[PDB]
mmCIF file of C-alpha atoms and ligand atoms in Angstrom:
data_model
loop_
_atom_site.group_PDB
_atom_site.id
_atom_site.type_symbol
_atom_site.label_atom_id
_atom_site.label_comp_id
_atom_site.label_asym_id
_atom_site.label_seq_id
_atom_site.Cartn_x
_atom_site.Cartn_y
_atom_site.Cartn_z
ATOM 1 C CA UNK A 6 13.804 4.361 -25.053
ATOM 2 C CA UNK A 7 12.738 2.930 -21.547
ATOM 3 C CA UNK A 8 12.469 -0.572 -20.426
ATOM 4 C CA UNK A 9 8.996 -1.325 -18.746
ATOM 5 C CA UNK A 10 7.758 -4.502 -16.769
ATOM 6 C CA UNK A 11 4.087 -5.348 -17.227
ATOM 7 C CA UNK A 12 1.710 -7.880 -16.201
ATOM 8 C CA UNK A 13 0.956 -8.696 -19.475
ATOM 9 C CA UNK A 14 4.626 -9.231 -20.819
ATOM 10 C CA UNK A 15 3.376 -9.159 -24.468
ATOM 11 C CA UNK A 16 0.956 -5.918 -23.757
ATOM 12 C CA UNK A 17 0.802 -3.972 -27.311
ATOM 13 C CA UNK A 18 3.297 -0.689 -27.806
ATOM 14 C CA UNK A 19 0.457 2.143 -27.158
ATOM 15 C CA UNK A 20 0.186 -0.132 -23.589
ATOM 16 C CA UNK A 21 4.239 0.043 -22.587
ATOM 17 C CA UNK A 22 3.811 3.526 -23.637
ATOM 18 C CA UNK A 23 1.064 4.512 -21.453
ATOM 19 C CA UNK A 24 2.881 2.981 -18.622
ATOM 20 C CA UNK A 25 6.138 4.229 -19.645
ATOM 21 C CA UNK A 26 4.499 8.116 -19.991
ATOM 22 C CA UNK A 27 2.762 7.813 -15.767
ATOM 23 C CA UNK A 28 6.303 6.827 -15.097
ATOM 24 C CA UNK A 29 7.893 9.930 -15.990
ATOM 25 C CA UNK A 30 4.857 12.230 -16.034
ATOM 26 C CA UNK A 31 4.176 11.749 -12.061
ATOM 27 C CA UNK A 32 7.161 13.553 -10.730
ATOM 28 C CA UNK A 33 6.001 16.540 -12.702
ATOM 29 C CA UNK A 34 2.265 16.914 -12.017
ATOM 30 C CA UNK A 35 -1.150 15.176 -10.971
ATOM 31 C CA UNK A 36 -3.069 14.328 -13.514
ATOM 32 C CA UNK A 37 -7.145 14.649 -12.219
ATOM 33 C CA UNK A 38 -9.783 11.452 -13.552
ATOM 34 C CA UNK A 39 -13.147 11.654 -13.207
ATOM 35 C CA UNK A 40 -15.720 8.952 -13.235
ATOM 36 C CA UNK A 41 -18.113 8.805 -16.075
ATOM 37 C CA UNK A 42 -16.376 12.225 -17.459
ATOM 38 C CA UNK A 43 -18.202 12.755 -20.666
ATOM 39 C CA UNK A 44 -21.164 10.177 -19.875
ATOM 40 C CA UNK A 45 -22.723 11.629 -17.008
ATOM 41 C CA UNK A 46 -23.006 15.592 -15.504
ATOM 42 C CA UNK A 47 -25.384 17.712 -14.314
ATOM 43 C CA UNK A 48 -24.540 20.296 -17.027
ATOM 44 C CA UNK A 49 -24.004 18.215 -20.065
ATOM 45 C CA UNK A 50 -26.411 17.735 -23.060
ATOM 46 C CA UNK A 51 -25.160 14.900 -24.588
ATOM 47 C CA UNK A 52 -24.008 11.704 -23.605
ATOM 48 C CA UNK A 53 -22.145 11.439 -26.923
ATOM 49 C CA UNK A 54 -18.500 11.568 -25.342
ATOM 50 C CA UNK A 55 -17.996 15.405 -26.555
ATOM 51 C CA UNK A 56 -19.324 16.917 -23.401
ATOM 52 C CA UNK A 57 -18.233 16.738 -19.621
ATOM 53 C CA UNK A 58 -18.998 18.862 -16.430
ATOM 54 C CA UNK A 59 -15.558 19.991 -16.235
ATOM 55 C CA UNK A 60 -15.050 21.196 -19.286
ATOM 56 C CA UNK A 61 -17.901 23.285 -18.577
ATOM 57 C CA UNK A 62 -16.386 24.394 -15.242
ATOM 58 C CA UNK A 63 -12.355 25.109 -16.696
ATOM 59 C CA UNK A 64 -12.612 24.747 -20.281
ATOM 60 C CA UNK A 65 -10.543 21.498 -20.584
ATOM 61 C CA UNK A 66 -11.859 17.595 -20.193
ATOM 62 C CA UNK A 67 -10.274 15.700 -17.178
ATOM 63 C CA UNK A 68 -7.190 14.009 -18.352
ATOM 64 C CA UNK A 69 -8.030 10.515 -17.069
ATOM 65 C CA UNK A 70 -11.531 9.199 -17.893
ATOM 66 C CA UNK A 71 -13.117 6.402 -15.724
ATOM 67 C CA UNK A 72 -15.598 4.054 -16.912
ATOM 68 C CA UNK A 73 -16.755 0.618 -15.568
ATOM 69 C CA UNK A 74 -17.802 -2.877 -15.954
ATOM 70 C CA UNK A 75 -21.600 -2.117 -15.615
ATOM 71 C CA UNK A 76 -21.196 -0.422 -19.809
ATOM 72 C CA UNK A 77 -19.441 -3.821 -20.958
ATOM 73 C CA UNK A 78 -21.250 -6.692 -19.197
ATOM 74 C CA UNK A 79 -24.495 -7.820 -19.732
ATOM 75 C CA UNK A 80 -27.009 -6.040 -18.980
ATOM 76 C CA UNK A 81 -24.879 -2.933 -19.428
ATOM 77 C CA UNK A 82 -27.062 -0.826 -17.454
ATOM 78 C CA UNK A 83 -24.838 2.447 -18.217
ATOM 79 C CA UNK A 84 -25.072 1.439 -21.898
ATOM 80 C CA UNK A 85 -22.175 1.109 -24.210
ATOM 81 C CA UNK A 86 -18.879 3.084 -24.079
ATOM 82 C CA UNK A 87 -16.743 2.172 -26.796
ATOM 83 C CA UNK A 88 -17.746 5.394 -28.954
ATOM 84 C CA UNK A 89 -16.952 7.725 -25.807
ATOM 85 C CA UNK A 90 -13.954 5.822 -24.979
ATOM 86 C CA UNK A 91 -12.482 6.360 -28.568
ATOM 87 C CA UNK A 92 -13.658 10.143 -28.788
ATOM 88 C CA UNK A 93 -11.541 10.259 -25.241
ATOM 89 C CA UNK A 94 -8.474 8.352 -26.773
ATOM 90 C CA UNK A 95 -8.686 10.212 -29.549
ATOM 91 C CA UNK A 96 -7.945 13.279 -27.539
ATOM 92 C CA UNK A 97 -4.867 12.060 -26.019
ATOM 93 C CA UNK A 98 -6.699 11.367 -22.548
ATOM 94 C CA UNK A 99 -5.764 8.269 -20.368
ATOM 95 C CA UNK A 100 -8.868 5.434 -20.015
ATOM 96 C CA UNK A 101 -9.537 3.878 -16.838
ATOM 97 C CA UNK A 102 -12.243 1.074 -16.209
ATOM 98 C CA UNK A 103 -13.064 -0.618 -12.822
ATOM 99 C CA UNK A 104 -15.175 -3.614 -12.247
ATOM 100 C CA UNK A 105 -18.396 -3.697 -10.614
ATOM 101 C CA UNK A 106 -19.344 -7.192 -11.466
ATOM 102 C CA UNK A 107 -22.455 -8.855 -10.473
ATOM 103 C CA UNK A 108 -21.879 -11.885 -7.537
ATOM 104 C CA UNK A 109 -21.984 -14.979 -9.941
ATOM 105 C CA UNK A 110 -23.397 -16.911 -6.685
ATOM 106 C CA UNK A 111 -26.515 -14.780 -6.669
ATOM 107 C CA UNK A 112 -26.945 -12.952 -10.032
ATOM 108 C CA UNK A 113 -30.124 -14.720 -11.300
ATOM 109 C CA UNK A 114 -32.011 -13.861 -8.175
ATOM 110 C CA UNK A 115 -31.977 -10.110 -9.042
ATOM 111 C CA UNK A 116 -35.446 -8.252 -8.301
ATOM 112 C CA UNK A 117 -35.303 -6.510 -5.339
ATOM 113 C CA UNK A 118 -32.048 -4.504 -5.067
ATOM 114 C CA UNK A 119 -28.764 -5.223 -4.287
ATOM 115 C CA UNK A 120 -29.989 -8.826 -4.712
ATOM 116 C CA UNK A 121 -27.322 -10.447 -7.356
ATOM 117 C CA UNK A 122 -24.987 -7.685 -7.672
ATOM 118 C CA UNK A 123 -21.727 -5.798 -6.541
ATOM 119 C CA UNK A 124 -23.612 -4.755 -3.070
ATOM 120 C CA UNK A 125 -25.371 -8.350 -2.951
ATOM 121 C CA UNK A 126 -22.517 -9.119 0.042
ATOM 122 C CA UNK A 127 -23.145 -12.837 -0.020
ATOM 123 C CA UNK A 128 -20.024 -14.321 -0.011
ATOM 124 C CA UNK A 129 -19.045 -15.654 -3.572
ATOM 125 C CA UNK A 130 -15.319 -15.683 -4.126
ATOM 126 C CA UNK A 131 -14.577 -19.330 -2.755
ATOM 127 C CA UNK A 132 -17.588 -20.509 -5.008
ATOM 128 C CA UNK A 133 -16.133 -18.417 -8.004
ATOM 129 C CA UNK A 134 -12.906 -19.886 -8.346
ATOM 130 C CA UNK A 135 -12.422 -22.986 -10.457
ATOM 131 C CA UNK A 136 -13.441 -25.753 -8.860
ATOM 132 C CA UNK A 137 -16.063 -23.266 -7.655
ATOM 133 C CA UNK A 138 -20.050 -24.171 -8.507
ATOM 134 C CA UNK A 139 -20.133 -20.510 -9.783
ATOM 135 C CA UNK A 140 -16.639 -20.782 -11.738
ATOM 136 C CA UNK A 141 -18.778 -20.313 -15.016
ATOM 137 C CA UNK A 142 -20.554 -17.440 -13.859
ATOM 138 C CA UNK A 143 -17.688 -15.341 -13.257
ATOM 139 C CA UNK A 144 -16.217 -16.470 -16.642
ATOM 140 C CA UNK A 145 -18.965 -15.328 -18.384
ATOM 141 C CA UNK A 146 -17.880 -11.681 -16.730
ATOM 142 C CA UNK A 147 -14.392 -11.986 -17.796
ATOM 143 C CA UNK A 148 -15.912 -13.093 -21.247
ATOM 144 C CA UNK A 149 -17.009 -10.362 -21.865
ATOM 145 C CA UNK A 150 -14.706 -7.800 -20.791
ATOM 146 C CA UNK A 151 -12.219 -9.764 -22.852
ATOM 147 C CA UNK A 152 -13.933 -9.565 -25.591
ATOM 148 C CA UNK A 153 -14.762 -5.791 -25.636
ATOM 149 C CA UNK A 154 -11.018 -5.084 -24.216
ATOM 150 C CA UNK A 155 -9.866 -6.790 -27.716
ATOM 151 C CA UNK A 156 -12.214 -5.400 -29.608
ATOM 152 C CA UNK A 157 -11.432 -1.419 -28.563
ATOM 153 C CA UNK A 158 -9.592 -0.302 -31.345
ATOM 154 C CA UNK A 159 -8.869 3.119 -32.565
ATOM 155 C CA UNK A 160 -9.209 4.809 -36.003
ATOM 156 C CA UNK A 161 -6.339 2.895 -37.094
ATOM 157 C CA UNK A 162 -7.334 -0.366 -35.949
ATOM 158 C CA UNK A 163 -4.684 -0.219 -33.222
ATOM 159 C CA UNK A 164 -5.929 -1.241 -29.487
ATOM 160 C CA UNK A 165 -6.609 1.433 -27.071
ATOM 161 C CA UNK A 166 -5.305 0.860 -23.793
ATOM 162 C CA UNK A 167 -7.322 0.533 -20.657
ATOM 163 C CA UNK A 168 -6.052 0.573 -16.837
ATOM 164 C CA UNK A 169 -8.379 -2.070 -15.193
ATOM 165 C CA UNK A 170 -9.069 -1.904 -11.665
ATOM 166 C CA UNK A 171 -10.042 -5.231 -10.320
ATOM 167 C CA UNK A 172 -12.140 -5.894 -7.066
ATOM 168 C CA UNK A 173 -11.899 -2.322 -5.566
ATOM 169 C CA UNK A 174 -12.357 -1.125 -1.546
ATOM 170 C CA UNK A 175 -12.150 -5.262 -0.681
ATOM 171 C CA UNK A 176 -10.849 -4.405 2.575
ATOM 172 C CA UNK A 177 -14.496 -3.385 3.582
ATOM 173 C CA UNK A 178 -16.920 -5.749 3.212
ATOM 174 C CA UNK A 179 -19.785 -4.269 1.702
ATOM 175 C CA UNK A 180 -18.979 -5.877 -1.928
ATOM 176 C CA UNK A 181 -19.315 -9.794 -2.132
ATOM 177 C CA UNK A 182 -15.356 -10.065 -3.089
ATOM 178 C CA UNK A 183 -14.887 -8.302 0.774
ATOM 179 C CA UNK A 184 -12.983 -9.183 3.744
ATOM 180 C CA UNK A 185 -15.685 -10.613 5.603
ATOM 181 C CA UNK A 186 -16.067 -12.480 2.273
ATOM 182 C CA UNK A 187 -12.869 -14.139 1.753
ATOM 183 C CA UNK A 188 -10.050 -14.892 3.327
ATOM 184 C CA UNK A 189 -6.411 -12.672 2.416
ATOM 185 C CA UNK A 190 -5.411 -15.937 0.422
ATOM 186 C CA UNK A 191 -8.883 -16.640 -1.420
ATOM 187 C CA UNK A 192 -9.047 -12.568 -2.776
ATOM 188 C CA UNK A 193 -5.717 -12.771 -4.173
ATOM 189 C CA UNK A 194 -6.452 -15.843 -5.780
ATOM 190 C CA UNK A 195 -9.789 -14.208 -7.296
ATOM 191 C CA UNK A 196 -7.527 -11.117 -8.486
ATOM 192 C CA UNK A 197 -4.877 -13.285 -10.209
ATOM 193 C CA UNK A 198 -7.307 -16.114 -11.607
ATOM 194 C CA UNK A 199 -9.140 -12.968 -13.497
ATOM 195 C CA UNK A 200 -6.021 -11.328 -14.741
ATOM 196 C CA UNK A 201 -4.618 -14.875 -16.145
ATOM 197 C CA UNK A 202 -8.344 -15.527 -17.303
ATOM 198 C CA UNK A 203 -8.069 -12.106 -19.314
ATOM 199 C CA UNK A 204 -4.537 -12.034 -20.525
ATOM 200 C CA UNK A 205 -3.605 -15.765 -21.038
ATOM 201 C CA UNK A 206 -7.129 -17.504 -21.606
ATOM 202 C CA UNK A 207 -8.536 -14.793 -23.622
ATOM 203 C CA UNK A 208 -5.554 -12.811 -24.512
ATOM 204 C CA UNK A 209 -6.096 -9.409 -23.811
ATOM 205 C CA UNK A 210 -3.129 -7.268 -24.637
ATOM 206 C CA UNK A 211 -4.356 -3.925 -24.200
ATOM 207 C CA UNK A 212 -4.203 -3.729 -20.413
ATOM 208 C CA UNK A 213 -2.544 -2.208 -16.830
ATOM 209 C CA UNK A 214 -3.807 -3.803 -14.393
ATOM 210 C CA UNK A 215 -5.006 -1.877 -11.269
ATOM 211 C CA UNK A 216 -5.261 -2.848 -7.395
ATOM 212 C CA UNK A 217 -7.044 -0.419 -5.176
ATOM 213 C CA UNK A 218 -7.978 -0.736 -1.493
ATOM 214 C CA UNK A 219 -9.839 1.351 0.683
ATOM 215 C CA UNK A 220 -7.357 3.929 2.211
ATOM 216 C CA UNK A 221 -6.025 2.453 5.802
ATOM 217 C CA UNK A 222 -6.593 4.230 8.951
ATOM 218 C CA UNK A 223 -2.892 2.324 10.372
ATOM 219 C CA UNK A 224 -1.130 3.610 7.340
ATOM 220 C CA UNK A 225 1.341 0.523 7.229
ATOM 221 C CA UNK A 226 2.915 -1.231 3.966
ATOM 222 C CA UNK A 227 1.667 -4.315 5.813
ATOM 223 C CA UNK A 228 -1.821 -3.519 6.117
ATOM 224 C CA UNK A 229 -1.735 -2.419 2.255
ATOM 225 C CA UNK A 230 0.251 -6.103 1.528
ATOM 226 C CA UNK A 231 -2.289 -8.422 3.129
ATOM 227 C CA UNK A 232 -4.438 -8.697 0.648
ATOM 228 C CA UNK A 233 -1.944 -7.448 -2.044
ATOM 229 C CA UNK A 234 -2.607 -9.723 -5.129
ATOM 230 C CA UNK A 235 1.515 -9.402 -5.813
ATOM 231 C CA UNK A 236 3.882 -7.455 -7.647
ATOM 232 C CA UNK A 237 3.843 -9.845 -10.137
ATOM 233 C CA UNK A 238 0.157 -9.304 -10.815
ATOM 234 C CA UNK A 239 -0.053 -5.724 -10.370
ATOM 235 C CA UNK A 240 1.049 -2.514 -12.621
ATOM 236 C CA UNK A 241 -0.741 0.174 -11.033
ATOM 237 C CA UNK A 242 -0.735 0.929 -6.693
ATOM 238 C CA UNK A 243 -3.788 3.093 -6.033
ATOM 239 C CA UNK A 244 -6.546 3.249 -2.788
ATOM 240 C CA UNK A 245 -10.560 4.619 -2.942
ATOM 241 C CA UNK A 246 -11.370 7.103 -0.269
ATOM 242 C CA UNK A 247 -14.297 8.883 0.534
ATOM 243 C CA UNK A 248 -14.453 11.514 3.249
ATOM 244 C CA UNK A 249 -16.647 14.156 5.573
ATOM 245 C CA UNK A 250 -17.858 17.461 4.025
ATOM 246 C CA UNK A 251 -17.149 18.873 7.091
ATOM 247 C CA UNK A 252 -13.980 18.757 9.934
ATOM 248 C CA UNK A 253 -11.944 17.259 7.447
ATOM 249 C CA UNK A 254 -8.366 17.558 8.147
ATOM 250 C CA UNK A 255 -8.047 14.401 9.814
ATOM 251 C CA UNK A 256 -9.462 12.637 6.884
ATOM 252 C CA UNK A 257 -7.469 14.768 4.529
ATOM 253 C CA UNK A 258 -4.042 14.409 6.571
ATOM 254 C CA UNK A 259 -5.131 10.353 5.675
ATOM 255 C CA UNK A 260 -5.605 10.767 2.113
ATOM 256 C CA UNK A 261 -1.629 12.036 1.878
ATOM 257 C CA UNK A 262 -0.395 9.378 4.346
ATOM 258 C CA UNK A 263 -2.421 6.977 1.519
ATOM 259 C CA UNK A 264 -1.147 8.161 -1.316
ATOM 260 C CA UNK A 265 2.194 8.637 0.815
ATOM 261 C CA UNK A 266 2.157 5.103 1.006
ATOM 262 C CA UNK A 267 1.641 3.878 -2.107
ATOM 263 C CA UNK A 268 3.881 6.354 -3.717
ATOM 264 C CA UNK A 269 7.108 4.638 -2.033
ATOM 265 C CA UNK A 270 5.981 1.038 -2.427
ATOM 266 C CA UNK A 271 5.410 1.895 -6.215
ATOM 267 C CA UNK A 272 8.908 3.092 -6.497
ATOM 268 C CA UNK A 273 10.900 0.130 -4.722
ATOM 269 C CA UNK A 274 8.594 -2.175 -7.058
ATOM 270 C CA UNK A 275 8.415 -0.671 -10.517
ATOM 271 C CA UNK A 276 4.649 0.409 -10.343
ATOM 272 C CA UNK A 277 2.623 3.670 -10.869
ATOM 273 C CA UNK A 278 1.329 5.076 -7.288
ATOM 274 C CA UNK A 279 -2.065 6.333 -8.169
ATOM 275 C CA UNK A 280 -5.484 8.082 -5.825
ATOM 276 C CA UNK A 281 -8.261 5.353 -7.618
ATOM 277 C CA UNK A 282 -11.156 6.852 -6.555
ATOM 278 C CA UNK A 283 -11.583 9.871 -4.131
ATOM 279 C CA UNK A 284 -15.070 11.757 -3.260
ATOM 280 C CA UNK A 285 -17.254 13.019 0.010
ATOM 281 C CA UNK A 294 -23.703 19.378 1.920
ATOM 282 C CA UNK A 295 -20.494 20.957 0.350
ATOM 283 C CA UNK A 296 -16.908 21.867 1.034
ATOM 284 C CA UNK A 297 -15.255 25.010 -1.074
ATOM 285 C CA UNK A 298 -12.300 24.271 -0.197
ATOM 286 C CA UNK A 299 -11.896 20.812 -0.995
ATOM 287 C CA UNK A 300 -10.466 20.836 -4.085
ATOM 288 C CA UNK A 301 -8.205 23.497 -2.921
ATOM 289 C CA UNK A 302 -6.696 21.278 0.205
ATOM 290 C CA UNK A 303 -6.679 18.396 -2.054
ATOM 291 C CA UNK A 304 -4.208 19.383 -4.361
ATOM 292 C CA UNK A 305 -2.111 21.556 -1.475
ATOM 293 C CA UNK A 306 -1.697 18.551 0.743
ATOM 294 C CA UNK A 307 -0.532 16.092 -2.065
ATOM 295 C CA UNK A 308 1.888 18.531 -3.623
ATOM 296 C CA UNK A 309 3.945 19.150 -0.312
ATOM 297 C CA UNK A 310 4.051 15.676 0.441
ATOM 298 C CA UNK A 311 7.416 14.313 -1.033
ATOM 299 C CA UNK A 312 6.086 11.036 -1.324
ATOM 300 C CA UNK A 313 2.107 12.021 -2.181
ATOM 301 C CA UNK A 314 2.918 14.089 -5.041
ATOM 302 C CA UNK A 315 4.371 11.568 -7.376
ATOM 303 C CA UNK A 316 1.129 10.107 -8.088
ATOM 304 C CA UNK A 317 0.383 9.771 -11.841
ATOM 305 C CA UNK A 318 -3.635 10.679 -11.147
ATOM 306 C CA UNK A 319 -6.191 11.577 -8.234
ATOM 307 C CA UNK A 320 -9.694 10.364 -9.465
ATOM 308 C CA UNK A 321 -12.996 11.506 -8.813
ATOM 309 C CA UNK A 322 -16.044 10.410 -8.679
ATOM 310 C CA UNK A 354 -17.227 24.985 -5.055
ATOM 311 C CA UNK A 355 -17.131 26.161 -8.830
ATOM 312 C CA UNK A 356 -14.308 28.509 -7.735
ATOM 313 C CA UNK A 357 -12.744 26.096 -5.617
ATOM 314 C CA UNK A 358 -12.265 23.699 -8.663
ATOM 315 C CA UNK A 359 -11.005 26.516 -11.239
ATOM 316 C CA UNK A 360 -8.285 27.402 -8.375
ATOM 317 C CA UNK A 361 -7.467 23.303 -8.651
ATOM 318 C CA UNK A 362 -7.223 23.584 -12.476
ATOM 319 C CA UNK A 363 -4.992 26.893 -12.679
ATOM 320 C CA UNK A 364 -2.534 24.932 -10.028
ATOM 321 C CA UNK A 365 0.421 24.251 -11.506
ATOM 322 C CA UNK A 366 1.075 20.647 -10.405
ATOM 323 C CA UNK A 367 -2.476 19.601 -11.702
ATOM 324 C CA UNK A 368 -2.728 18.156 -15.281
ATOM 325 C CA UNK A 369 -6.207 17.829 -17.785
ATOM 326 C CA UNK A 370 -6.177 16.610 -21.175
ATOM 327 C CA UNK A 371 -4.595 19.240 -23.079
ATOM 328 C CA UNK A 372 -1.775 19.314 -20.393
ATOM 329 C CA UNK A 373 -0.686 15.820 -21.506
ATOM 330 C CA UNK A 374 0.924 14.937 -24.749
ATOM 331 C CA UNK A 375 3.369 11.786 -26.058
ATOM 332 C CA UNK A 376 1.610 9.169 -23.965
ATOM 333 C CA UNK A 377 0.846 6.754 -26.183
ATOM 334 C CA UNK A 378 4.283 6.353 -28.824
ATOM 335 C CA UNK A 379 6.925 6.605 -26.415
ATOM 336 C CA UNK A 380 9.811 3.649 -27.488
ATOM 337 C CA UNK A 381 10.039 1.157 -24.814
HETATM 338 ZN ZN1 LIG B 401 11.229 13.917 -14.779
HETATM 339 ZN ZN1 LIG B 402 -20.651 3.656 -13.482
HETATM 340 ZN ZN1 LIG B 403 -12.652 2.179 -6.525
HETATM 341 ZN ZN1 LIG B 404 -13.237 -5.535 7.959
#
């Protein structure tokens, strides 16, 4: 038995669990995500949730699948993923969902692209908020990811828990919830209004709730805390990077300093340190200087997961030692808390 501190104080048992198993399991490996894992590939033949790229590459799924909001809210334009999500959960692997919601300012104006959606960079969180003309409109989002969160439930009718990444890379502003969008004070209201919409309006109980900036250049715990949403809104410390193909130690030498980063603030505030979202021509090494830079930082390695979103290169990455797929995880989801 472990006591764990959630954002959702009444999250279900599998939830505490799932928390309670990244707490332990990232001082002993990295586990490796992948976006769209057994939806998308270039070598898959079905989209059925029983096939991914890298299990055609090492023989073993990734153990943390990611997923987002454009398969739950209308017009779910990636289509459903409830059946994928369960064959995935059913497996033992670790579900991760970001969202890439719409900008309720601008959304019925879509037609020519990014017009009305994530990329659509007119501002729209002061609008959003309550009080907000487009208060409704973002409520409708929530909605709906509410009511698919409480509605994902295994073959036992037990809830499958989900790590939800709210409002990603907002300290660019190239999504409409950015920094040239908001002020520090008006994005952390956004991020906490949605996680009390979800958990006390609507009561979702089946979620972690992720925060994930882009990766600073001034690697500083106050840079990552100005437009922190709070520890008291928070369970899971992560950053999205995306680097050169080419002359990439600098950027590399970054992503450890990153993950350095969140590492130690995760520990001196009860939360899992995590690598969101990490991507880039090709580099066959890449995998290969990912996973030998983390591991010899102190700090970097005790991240739960690195996520992703040169065939050699990635079997080296899976026959490391310190990296973790599906079948490399086990207990996650009835540990006693
Ligand atoms: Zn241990
Ligand atoms: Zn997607
Ligand atoms: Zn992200
Ligand atoms: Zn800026």
């Amino acid at each position: 038995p472990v006591t764990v501190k959630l954002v959702d104080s009444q999250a279900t048992m599998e939830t505490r669990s799932l928390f309670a198993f990244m707490q332990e399991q990232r001082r002993h490996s990295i586990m490796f995500g992948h976006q769209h894992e057994t939806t998308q590939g270039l070598t898959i033949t079905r989209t059925d949730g029983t096939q991914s790229d890298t299990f055609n590459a090492v023989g073993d799924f990734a153990a943390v699948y990611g997923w987002d909001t454009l398969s739950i809210v209308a017009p779910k334009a990636e289509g459903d993923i409830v059946a994928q999500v369960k064959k995935a959960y059913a497996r033992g692997g670790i579900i991760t969902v970001s969202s890439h919601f719409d900008n309720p300012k601008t959304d019925t104006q879509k037609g020519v692209w990014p017009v009305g959606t994530s990329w659509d960079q007119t501002p729209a969180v002061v609008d959003s908020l309550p009080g907000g003309a487009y208060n409704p409109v973002l409520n409708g989002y929530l909605d709906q990811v509410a009511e698919w969160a409480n509605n994902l439930k295994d073959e036992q009718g037990r809830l499958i828990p989900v790590i939800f990444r709210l409002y990603h890379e907002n300290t660019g502003s190239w999504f409409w919830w950015g920094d040239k969008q908001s002020t520090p004070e008006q994005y952390k209201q956004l991020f906490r209004y949605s996680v009390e919409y979800l958990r006390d309006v609507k009561g979702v109980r089946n979620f972690l709730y992720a925060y994930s900036p882009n990766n600073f250049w001034d690697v500083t715990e106050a840079n990552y805390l100005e437009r922190y949403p709070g520890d008291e809104w928070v369970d899971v410390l992560g950053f999205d990077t995306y680097g050169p193909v080419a002359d990439n130690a600098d950027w590399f030498r970054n992503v450890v300093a990153n993950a350095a980063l969140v590492a130690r603030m995760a520990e001196a505030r009860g939360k899992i340190p995590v690598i969101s979202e990490i991507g880039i021509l090709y580099d066959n090494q890449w995998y290969r200087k990912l996973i030998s830079g983390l591991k010899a930082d102190p700090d970097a390695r005790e991240i739960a997961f690195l996520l992703v979103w040169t065939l050699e290169d990635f079997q080296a990455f899976y026959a490391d030692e310190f990296t973790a797929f599906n079948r490399d995880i086990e207990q996650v989801y009835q540990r006693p808390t």
